Amino acid sequence: RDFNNLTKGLCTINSWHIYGKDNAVRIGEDSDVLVTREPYVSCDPDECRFYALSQGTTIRGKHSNGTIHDRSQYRALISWPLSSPPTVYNSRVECIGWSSTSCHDGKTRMSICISGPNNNASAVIWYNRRPVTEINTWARNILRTQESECVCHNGVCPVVFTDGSATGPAETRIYYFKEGKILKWEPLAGTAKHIEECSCYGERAEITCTCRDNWQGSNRPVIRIDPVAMTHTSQYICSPVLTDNPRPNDPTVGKCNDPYPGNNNNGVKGFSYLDGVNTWLGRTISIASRSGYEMLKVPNALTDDKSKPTQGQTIVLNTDWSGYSGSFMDYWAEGECYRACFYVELIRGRPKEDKVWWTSNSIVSMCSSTEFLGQWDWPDGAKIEYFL
Amino acid sequence: RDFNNLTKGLCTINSWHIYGKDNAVRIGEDSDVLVTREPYVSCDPDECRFYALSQGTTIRGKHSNGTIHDRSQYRALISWPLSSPPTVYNSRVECIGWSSTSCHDGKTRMSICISGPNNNASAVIWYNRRPVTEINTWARNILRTQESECVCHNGVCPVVFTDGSATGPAETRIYYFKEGKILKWEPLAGTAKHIEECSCYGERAEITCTCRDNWQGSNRPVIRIDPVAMTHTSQYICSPVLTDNPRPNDPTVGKCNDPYPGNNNNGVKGFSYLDGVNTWLGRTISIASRSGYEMLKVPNALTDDKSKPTQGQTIVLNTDWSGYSGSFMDYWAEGECYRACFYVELIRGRPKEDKVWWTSNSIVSMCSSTEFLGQWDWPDGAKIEYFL
Amino acid sequence: RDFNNLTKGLCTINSWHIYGKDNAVRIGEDSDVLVTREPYVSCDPDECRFYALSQGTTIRGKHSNGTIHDRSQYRALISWPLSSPPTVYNSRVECIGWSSTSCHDGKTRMSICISGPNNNASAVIWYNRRPVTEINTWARNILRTQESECVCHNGVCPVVFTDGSATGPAETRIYYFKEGKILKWEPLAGTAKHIEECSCYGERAEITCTCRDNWQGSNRPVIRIDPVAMTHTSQYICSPVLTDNPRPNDPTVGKCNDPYPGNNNNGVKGFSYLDGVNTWLGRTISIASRSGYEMLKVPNALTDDKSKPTQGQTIVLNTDWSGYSGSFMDYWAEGECYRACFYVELIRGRPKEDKVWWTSNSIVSMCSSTEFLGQWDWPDGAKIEYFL
Amino acid sequence: RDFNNLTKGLCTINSWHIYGKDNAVRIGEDSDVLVTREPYVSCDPDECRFYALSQGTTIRGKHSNGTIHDRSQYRALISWPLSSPPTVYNSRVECIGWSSTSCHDGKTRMSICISGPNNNASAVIWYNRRPVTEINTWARNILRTQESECVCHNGVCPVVFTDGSATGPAETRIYYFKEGKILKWEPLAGTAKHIEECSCYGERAEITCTCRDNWQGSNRPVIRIDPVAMTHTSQYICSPVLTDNPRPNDPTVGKCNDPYPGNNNNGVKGFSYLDGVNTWLGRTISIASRSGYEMLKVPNALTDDKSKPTQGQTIVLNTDWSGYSGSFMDYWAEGECYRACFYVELIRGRPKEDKVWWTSNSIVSMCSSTEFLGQWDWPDGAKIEYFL
Ligand SMILES: CC(=O)N[C@H]1[C@H]([C@H](O)[C@H](O)CO)O[C@@](O)(C(=O)O)C[C@@H]1O
Ligand SMILES: CC(=O)N[C@H]1[C@H]([C@H](O)[C@H](O)CO)O[C@@](O)(C(=O)O)C[C@@H]1O
Ligand SMILES: CC(=O)N[C@H]1[C@H]([C@H](O)[C@H](O)CO)O[C@@](O)(C(=O)O)C[C@@H]1O
Ligand SMILES: CC(=O)N[C@H]1[C@H]([C@H](O)[C@H](O)CO)O[C@@](O)(C(=O)O)C[C@@H]1O
Ligand SMILES: CC(=O)N[C@H]1[C@H]([C@H](O)[C@H](O)CO)O[C@@](O)(C(=O)O)C[C@@H]1O
Ligand SMILES: CC(=O)N[C@H]1[C@H]([C@H](O)[C@H](O)CO)O[C@@](O)(C(=O)O)C[C@@H]1O
Ligand SMILES: CC(=O)N[C@H]1[C@H]([C@H](O)[C@H](O)CO)O[C@@](O)(C(=O)O)C[C@@H]1O
Ligand SMILES: CC(=O)N[C@H]1[C@H]([C@H](O)[C@H](O)CO)O[C@@](O)(C(=O)O)C[C@@H]1O
Ligand SMILES: [Ca+2]
Ligand SMILES: [Ca+2]
Ligand SMILES: [Ca+2]
Ligand SMILES: [Ca+2]
Secondary structure: OOOOOOOOEEOOOOEEEEEEEOOHHHHHOOOOEEEEEEEEEEEEOOEEEEEEEEEEEEOOOHHHOOOOOOOOOOOEEEEEEOOOOOEOOOOEEEEEOOEEEEEEOOOOEEEEEEEOOOOOOEEEEEEOOEEEEEEEOOOOOOOEOOOOOOOOEOOEEEEEEEEEOOOOOEEEEEEEEEOOEEEEEEEOOOOOOOOEEEEEEEEOOEEEEEEEOOOOOOOOEEEEEEOOOOEEEEEEOOOOOOOOOOOOOOOOOOOOOOOOOOOOOOOOOOOEEOOOOOOEEEEOOOOOOOEEEEEEEOOOOOOOOOOOOOEEEEEEEEEEEOOOEEEEOOOOOOOOEEOOEEEEEEEEEOOOOOOOOOEEEEEEEEEEEOOOOOOOOOOOOOOHHHHO | OOOOOOOOEEOOOOEEEEEEEOOHHHHHOOOOEEEEEEEEEEEEOOEEEEEEEEEEEEOOOHHHOOOOOOOOOOOEEEEEEOOOOOEOOOOEEEEEOOEEEEEEOOOOEEEEEEEOOOOOOEEEEEEOOEEEEEEEOOOOOOOEOOOOOOOOEOOEEEEEEEEEOOOOOEEEEEEEEEOOEEEEEEEOOOOOOOOEEEEEEEEOOEEEEEEEOOOOOOOOEEEEEEOOOOEEEEEEOOOOOOOOOOOOOOOOOOOOOOOOOOOOOOOOOOOEEOOOOOOEEEEOOOOOOOEEEEEEEOOOOOOOOOOOOOEEEEEEEEEEEOOOEEEEOOOOOOOOEEOOEEEEEEEEEOOOOOOOOOEEEEEEEEEEEOOOOOOOOOOOOOOHHHHO | OOOOOOOOEEOOOOEEEEEEEOOHHHHHOOOOEEEEEEEEEEEEOOEEEEEEEEEEEEOOOHHHOOOOOOOOOOOEEEEEEOOOOOEOOOOEEEEEOOEEEEEEOOOOEEEEEEEOOOOOOEEEEEEOOEEEEEEEOOOOOOOEOOOOOOOOEOOEEEEEEEEEOOOOOEEEEEEEEEOOEEEEEEEOOOOOOOOEEEEEEEEOOEEEEEEEOOOOOOOOEEEEEEOOOOEEEEEEOOOOOOOOOOOOOOOOOOOOOOOOOOOOOOOOOOOEEOOOOOOEEEEOOOOOOOEEEEEEEOOOOOOOOOOOOOEEEEEEEEEEEOOOEEEEOOOOOOOOEEOOEEEEEEEEEOOOOOOOOOEEEEEEEEEEEOOOOOOOOOOOOOOHHHHO | OOOOOOOOEEOOOOEEEEEEEOOHHHHHOOOOEEEEEEEEEEEEOOEEEEEEEEEEEEOOOHHHOOOOOOOOOOOEEEEEEOOOOOEOOOOEEEEEOOEEEEEEOOOOEEEEEEEOOOOOOEEEEEEOOEEEEEEEOOOOOOOEOOOOOOOOEOOEEEEEEEEEOOOOOEEEEEEEEEOOEEEEEEEOOOOOOOOEEEEEEEEOOEEEEEEEOOOOOOOOEEEEEEOOOOEEEEEEOOOOOOOOOOOOOOOOOOOOOOOOOOOOOOOOOOOEEOOOOOOEEEEOOOOOOOEEEEEEEOOOOOOOOOOOOOEEEEEEEEEEEOOOEEEEOOOOOOOOEEOOEEEEEEEEEOOOOOOOOOEEEEEEEEEEEOOOOOOOOOOOOOOHHHHO
């Protein structure tokens, strides 16, 4: 009933514990599970849920053929109970479209879906499950947003959008929403040169987003937002522990204010928690494909251009498929600190497994522990041969 | 807890944004989706839902054979969560029958289903999910009603019924319900010559219904209802932009008080928003079949017999199947005006696609934006060949 | 929150309107619908539901083979939303067993299931969805009860049980429950000679049950219960309009205090509303099998041994299968009178349709109207050939 | 809203009445039922539910192949409505892992799941459906817990864990949780020599757990816990009525403080109610396999090393498969005493039925009656041949 404020710091991250896993592809082999991609997790004050972009067809359905494609009229933001699969029967549609974000402000939820042709897309902003505001494309080139949850502070929920080229300069804007209405927007500033798919979290009245530089950067750009002043800055993770994909091999020195070069015109959505010595980065294990997943403790990664790992945890083996990854937290949990969480999208099917005509995924997520817990690896678990 | 009153005017309609889409036929290829037709959308104070007439069988079911037929003992008004498909497992039965309307009065919902043989049908009026009033056929020839939501003002919810010929004069009545009980009824008056399937909306204490003249009219008849005085008038859309189907080509001058001739004994359910310069008409793109769908801004369409379009938006391409269309609004949304919405029924199967033995549909709906948003088209999306 | 009292009389029954229909066999041809039999309907203060005895298998399932049998360890009382089918996914288990009754007292629901071998059955009485009281077989021969709803007055809910022979004298008891606990029980008294499967309703502080005399009677026995005094009487419907099945042809004079002879050791569950001139009897149309269903207005049927029909309504054609029938009312509806309702079980499969190895049913129900409504017939609607 | 206290004694157990049965394997032959094992039952103040460890696949699914294995990344604690089957669509995930316990403290529920590799497992303790505490393996050898409900008193919920060898001494700890946080833990004390899979219940401020001595004991070890002092003792059931499996034949004298020998390195989860003369033991009927199930009244079983049965009830015939068994009660029921309940896991498939490639189960549960009720037997009911 009151707006949530980001009054807590991050809990100390000494390891990662299992939080949720839906095993959707394994289950959907013989049940009515929707084809998805671009998943995430997001909490309300009373419940945490899985989110994704449906493809408007089940995996066993004949319409799963062609679901490698990102943008169609048959996609929607859906949510469903934590660690359940996204089924026809339990999935709740938040809005229609092929790019999305969602977050709860303490009173109710804002959800945003973008749809349309590449040269004529529009965002619709829903609040309390009703449409409130619409925003037309400004650069006529795939208006797109975070693909993971936004974050609110005292009713203000900033959102990062990009419109324009994926392979060159583009037009990124930060919109400050309150009750679904635009209070303010700003063009991107600071030293980040290209922004896509920001993964955001909040602590002590500041919002930190780790994004994707698709054009040039194999280091990740970072936007930090003041939701009270409604202003921001941007830079890159200084660390030579490079966290995009594909990427070149790790150097000994990163770049703070420019893209680390070697790979152009590609990338993957990812995240980090940047908190002094309590800093952890996620990356694919493979430098070449969306394969494996690990967390690395890299003290002062944001500001130290020579920072290297001091601790890690494997999440997905390099012999298993990963995908997108992003940040969320339960802002309504008990205790004195916010417990960092993340999910990894485990992509199955095309293009890496082309004996099937579909592309989908399942989800695994973890939250931080102050213990030093033993590690397991967490693969999707399905046998593609079963679908043949 | 208090009855809703129609105290707001329409918001300015500068374009249409995507509101919901269930992709039911695509999904139902490989999941337990009910065969439907005659869908619509209707809001409660806390939730908006999809509605339709079930055929009492799934699409993949063997009993889907013969579902081209309109009236059987196996039909029911069902509702289900917005943008979900109507499945066996999530569909809520409102009442039994093969013609329906439904609306929430601010306190609770009235639903009306008609059933019976052609010469002996009866309406049952449910209120708060209990049967309250029954009305026997008066002309012994397919008692039938709106096939989209009714509208209430201070507890009074008028409903348009017709009984008698589809190809000649018939007996249309306006019933004024309150808490499921008949306060009053009137025979149709004014200059409309035949009435079927009224699509209604409310603003500033007046209810406007755009209907179907099946007998002679390719322009659409309009009934306007005063729910306080419980009186009405009727006429036609004066505009030469003709909105029934099938229809002749558009002339340069319409008819205000008579059917525009050229096509007899056929039609399709449709709608309009008639609000001075803020007037938008829906129509099929094709003059010959239920094919394509567009919105056209036609200032003063109701009263100006030479009014032509000043703006439009394609909703469904002429190379895709459409169907019935109708009006609803979220009367319980925030803000200072009512946002116009509509749905289009996207019919698949018979008679146009006769390699399958069924007829069903999916739903797409839009609401108005005060922005000038880019357009997409929104087809059903299923491949009939998959069902062979 | 207070116990319901039976303070109203019956509404005037001038005809019957459609109330609910699940089309379960049609739907279950291609969806996960449970095999059932012995269905009924029962209301809570906020909701009316369908009830039946599951067979613990779907209709398309291989375990549907053998479901002609009445009593197994795999049966349960289930309930589900009105006019939905009883599916694996929406069916709520009330208790385990192969004979049941259920009713809401205004505060919460009592449900009773009997299970066990023929010579060692026991009833368990649940109240507020917890087990409270148990009753062991007293005659060691299929302890059994109503197979339709019980009725409560000020917290007292009487229930009719029988234990002993189906083809000879047996031991019938009336148990008076309050909050799941036995206040009192009585052995059957009056002139009814054999009692099974009582269909009960309540009005003006009196409960009337129309039952099945399996041993000798083709007229139906009637128990009338005073739930305040906790006493009862019994007799037969005096009317020569005979309402059991199988039965001989109607005579011109019935029997008030003895079984009307001609058919031994068989019958079907049925019901009536006995209310002076406002008296309506249900029966199968066929005298030989569970085929067709009609309602007949038979003024003073209970007390007039020459009473004949003055009005009727066909519910199911004689060319369609029927089955069990029973009474319920919405005791929590608005208005000044209780509206009589009933359901008919539409049995499909064995023994009448033996090309399938299963037996199941769907449900149709009607409530009374004070109008003289036109009639339709309401068959199950499934094609058995589809299941071959 | 207040913590529950164990203020009542056990009701007198004169027999066992049927409480719930899901028939999951029968149903899942033709519906989307999850593969499970290690089930139990547990009540909240408003609802009792079935619980089990999913295998993250349906039974008909191709991924059911290999589900004989106990520990994978695809397992989760799920719960679902009482006597329903665990389906994809109705199952709620409590946490991720391959060993679990769960209990409600009167205010909210604690659930515990352990996951990880054998040498590096960890428990996560959820409370109010959020992760609160984590515990790393202490002996690096399959950290594991009860596989049935825990019990709380004034907010304190003790839990028994074991880590280390299954075939030798191991390290068992009793953790005392309150609101998901560790108040205290103790190493196992008393004369029990090996502890696994404790089945617990509470009465008069004391918690009694009957466990599994896998290493040496065919009598069952017992831990009794004081949740106020947070202290415990342990011993064995003195009775010569031996209740583990496999086991040697019953002797005439048991052992109170040592394992009864004859069978090493194997066992099954089981339970008892130890209450002076009101003492009942469950066991498999077979001494060799998980076959049959009976309850035996064995006065003073705990303390009398010559105690023999005075009464019994067969639950599952020796010609039917059983499995794990455990205790729960509805601590929130009305009345003056706690009614003892239990479930039996009915395992189907491997290793005993190896013509199928899966292993799963269904559930049956009973609660005590103060009547002397007739008995039935309660098999799983599925035909394995149907799955071939
Ligand atoms: C809105 C949209 O189409 N987003 C798509 C993006 C963009 O193509 C890139 O961010 C380049 O801008 O990336 C994906 O293709 C990918 O890499 O898996 C998936 C995603 O659906
Ligand atoms: C999941 C999986 O099998 N990953 C393998 C990948 C992929 O096969 C290709 O990168 C895709 O083209 O290749 C590796 O050489 C790599 O990139 O580190 C090794 C890894 O074992
Ligand atoms: C009650 C009823 O049968 N309504 C049917 C109507 C009427 O036939 C026409 O309005 C003529 O009166 O139109 C349809 O056939 C149609 O055109 O798709 C469908 C609809 O189910
Ligand atoms: C969805 C679709 O394919 N529509 C086509 C229709 C139909 O084929 C017929 O009208 C049905 O008989 O025909 C058109 O000539 C028309 O009417 O404008 C062109 C349009 O492309
Ligand atoms: C408890 C029980 O077995 N009830 C069964 C009864 C009894 O056999 C009769 O009432 C004779 O007592 O009738 C049926 O067989 C029937 O006629 O369709 C179905 C029902 O399940
Ligand atoms: C549903 C149905 O087909 N009913 C028919 C029944 C059954 O075939 C047999 O009674 C069953 O053995 O037979 C009749 O002669 C009858 O009894 O009145 C006519 C009726 O048309
Ligand atoms: C955590 C774990 O693996 N538990 C497994 C246990 C242990 O192996 C034994 O208790 C020996 O410690 O027993 C089972 O194998 C069994 O006997 O059916 C099933 C269960 O899943
Ligand atoms: C369910 C079942 O069939 N149980 C039978 C079992 C099993 O076949 C084997 O014990 C498994 O190997 O064997 C018995 O000799 C036994 O142990 O008492 C008899 C019993 O009838
Ligand atoms: Ca990049
Ligand atoms: Ca027309
Ligand atoms: Ca009889
Ligand atoms: Ca053992």
